[PDB]
Swiss-Prot record, chain C:
Domains (record comment): Composed of an N-terminal stalk, a dynein-like core comprised of two catalytically active and four inactive ATPase domains, and a C-terminal E3 module. The ATPase regions do not generate movement but rather act like an intricate molecular 'switch'. The RING-type zinc finger domain is required for the ubiquitin-protein ligase activity.
Disease implication from the record: Moyamoya disease 2: A progressive cerebral angiopathy characterized by bilateral intracranial carotid artery stenosis and telangiectatic vessels in the region of the basal ganglia. The abnormal vessels resemble a 'puff of smoke' (moyamoya) on cerebral angiogram. Affected individuals can develop transient ischemic attacks and/or cerebral infarction, and rupture of the collateral vessels can cause intracranial hemorrhage. Hemiplegia of sudden onset and epileptic seizures constitute the prevailing presentation in childhood, while subarachnoid bleeding occurs more frequently in adults.
Post-translational modification: Autoubiquitinated.
Subunit structure: Monomer. Interacts with UBE2L3/UBCH7; UBE2L3/UBCH7 is the most efficient ubiquitin-conjugating enzyme E2 for the ubiquitin ligase activity. Interacts with UBE2N/UBC13; promoting 'Lys-63'-linked ubiquitination of target proteins. (Microbial infection) Interacts with M.tuberculosis protein Rv3655c, which impairs caspase-8 activation and suppresses macrophage apoptosis by blocking the extrinsic pathway.
Family: Belongs to the AAA ATPase family.
Boundaries of the shown chain within the full protein: 4984 to 5058 of 5207
Name of this protein: E3 ubiquitin-protein ligase RNF213
Function: Atypical E3 ubiquitin ligase that can catalyze ubiquitination of both proteins and lipids, and which is involved in various processes, such as lipid metabolism, angiogenesis and cell-autonomous immunity. Acts as a key immune sensor by catalyzing ubiquitination of the lipid A moiety of bacterial lipopolysaccharide (LPS) via its RZ-type zinc-finger: restricts the proliferation of cytosolic bacteria, such as Salmonella, by generating the bacterial ubiquitin coat through the ubiquitination of LPS.
Subcellular location: Cytoplasm, Cytosol; Lipid droplet
Induction data: Down-regulated by let-7c miRNA, which binds to the 3'-UTR transcript of RNF213. Induced by pro-inflammatory cytokines.
Tissues expressed in: Widely expressed (at protein level).
Taxonomy, superkingdom: Eukaryota
Swiss-Prot record, chain E:
Subunit text: Monomer. Interacts with UBE2L3/UBCH7; UBE2L3/UBCH7 is the most efficient ubiquitin-conjugating enzyme E2 for the ubiquitin ligase activity. Interacts with UBE2N/UBC13; promoting 'Lys-63'-linked ubiquitination of target proteins. (Microbial infection) Interacts with M.tuberculosis protein Rv3655c, which impairs caspase-8 activation and suppresses macrophage apoptosis by blocking the extrinsic pathway.
Record PTM: Autoubiquitinated.
Record note on what altering residue 43 to A does: Abolished ability to ubiquitinate lipopolysaccharide
Subcellular location: Cytoplasm, Cytosol; Lipid droplet
From-to range in the entire protein, with total length: 4459 to 4683 of 5207
Binding-site residues for Zn(2+) 3, renumbered to this chain: 39, 43, 47, 50
Function: Atypical E3 ubiquitin ligase that can catalyze ubiquitination of both proteins and lipids, and which is involved in various processes, such as lipid metabolism, angiogenesis and cell-autonomous immunity. Acts as a key immune sensor by catalyzing ubiquitination of the lipid A moiety of bacterial lipopolysaccharide (LPS) via its RZ-type zinc-finger: restricts the proliferation of cytosolic bacteria, such as Salmonella, by generating the bacterial ubiquitin coat through the ubiquitination of LPS.
The protein, known as: E3 ubiquitin-protein ligase RNF213
Tissue: Widely expressed (at protein level).
Outcome of mutating residue 134 to V: Rare variant detected in a sporadic case of Moyamoya disease in East Asian population
Consequence of substituting residue 143 to S: Rare variant detected in a patient with Moyamoya disease in Caucasian population
Domain notes per entry: Composed of an N-terminal stalk, a dynein-like core comprised of two catalytically active and four inactive ATPase domains, and a C-terminal E3 module. The ATPase regions do not generate movement but rather act like an intricate molecular 'switch'.
Intrachain disulfide bonds: none
Amino acid sequence: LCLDRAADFLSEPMAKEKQCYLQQVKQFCIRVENDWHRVYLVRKLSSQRGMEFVQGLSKPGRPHQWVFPK
Amino acid sequence: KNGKERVPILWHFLQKEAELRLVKFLPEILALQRDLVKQFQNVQQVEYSSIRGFLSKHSSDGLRQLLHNRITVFLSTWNKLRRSLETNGEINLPKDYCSTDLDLDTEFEILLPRRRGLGLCATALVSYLIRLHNEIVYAVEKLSKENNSY
Amino acid sequence: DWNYEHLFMDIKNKMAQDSLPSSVISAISGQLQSYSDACEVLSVVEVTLGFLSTAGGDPNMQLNVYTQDILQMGD
Amino acid sequence: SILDTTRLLRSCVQSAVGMLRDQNESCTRNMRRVVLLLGLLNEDDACHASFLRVSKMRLSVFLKKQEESQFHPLEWLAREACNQDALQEAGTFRHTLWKRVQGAVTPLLASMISFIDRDGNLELLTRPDTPPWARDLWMFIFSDTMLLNIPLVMYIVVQNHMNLSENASNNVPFSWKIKDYLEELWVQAQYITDAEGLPKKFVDIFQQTPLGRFLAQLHGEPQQELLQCYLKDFILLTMRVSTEEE
Amino acid sequence: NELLEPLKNLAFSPATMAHAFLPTMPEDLLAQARHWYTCPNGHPCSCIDCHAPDRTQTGHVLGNPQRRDVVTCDRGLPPVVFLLIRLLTHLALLLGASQSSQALINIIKPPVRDPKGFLQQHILKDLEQLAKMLGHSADETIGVVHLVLRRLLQEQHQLSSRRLLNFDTELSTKEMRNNWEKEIAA
Ligand SMILES: [Zn+2]
């Protein structure tokens, strides 16, 4: 449910505390190393926006490269 | 799942939910219109230019802000339902009225639910809300097999 | 602008109405050899019309008794 | 004095009452209003005298406000002498003038009667069983010009709020105004205050009003009776009730 | 297939459809149900205020796409099928705008300056609604649209005969439009 909430916050096409939450999610994904979590996040994004949005986020110069596994 | 037969009340409720949620306001809108009538009843000329002016005269802070809140509720509900009122509602309404959104600069007459002029809008909303409530109540009666109508 | 027509319809609904007999018409016609007096009488009739339209009353009640006793419309 | 205003009011009472229409469709109201007004418009007891005085005062106020919207309000006599229709309708010049003043006063008297006699108020002045506090508060409110704000108007509908029956009267004078006034003071205290302090602030604001000080002068058993009457009137103004046991 | 002809008129020959009725419209239910009565002078009455005892439009009448939160169908069709029909209509209208903008500016009510963008936004809102309804991913939704278009391409050789098509290629009236809607939904 936390990852879903982050996926929604990211799917939007601008508040500080939401960014605090996304940062905490980023730290949790990096710390725990159960990459399954990021797979779910990627999957959720595809459900909402589509595969091309995610492919775009994988490209260089992007702020959300942490969403992806290694 | 063939809900119309198997579940008519749920079916109708789901169909009209978007608008039925707005039925909750009608106590407030009715109170507003009733107080406006009380103030303006027996008055012949109405010299108020807009809502902003009317509020500015009722500038006492408590009263100003209560009236403002109530008018905001009315304007929101109108803005949402207006395109439905343009076709359904049993009260005919020129397209110009429903065409654009309303704001505090709108004419004041829109709030007075007289049977002529822009006040038909105040009447129409009150009527169309009532319809929704009544209509779903009918469905329950049609499945109650009883005559508890009070 | 007074819509006397509505008052008349209300009264007719509430009470009966009948035309003036020729005798009464000639009598009032003879008595009212003055515009002022006509206006006075007509004002009493207008007040009575209003009250009757609202409340009503006995179609056979004499108008003078009604105005003087009930409406206390002396003076 | 210049003119016998008491007689002119008494002459215009029937026409004014005749202008009044009620929502509840209580047919027999206007006749009783006529009787009540002809009884009250006297200088027999101090209550009638004060009622008449306050009526005359409020009429003068309305007339002054209307006059301040017209040019040369002193030239009214002249204007009447310029109206052949009025002259021939009246016959004499004195009568023309008398009718002019009657025509001016009738609408305003009708409006004021619509305000004072909203539900059954006037019975309280006349019913001899009416307690003293009721008559005192009735005349206090009627005399006040900022509490009983009566706006000018240039068919009159008597805004009955209760569904009371015939010849019945609100248990408290001007219960509708008192309720509206207390609700206004509530709104003001609420926005001026936080959820706490609003009770004490609202009670203080009220106590400082003229009406609050007046009711504060009522001591002992009268005050209890007052509160009881207001409770009943309050319910009838708020809630529709089917029976007296309820 | 003749069923396609209205949409084709929108796409390639919009000028003809100027006064045509489009599925992208609601109707006046009051005229169709044939309470408030009305006086001869035009004011309602449940006499009062005097003492004396069609609203349906042509063309595209849906306004700003932002308002399109939910889909409602009064003609008994399932919201999903009406949504898909409306989406096909918007695609045809976009094609027509590509052919001639002025035609769509005439057909759109209230008028607009950018038909293409307006129709794009409506289409996007349609897709959002479809997603909410069926509950599939965005790509699966677009797939549903392609599947329907494919069905329509296939259902001509089997539907070019034995048909009961009570509609005109220009949807000159309200009933013609309703009938076309029902056949499409079928
Ligand atoms: Zn009417």
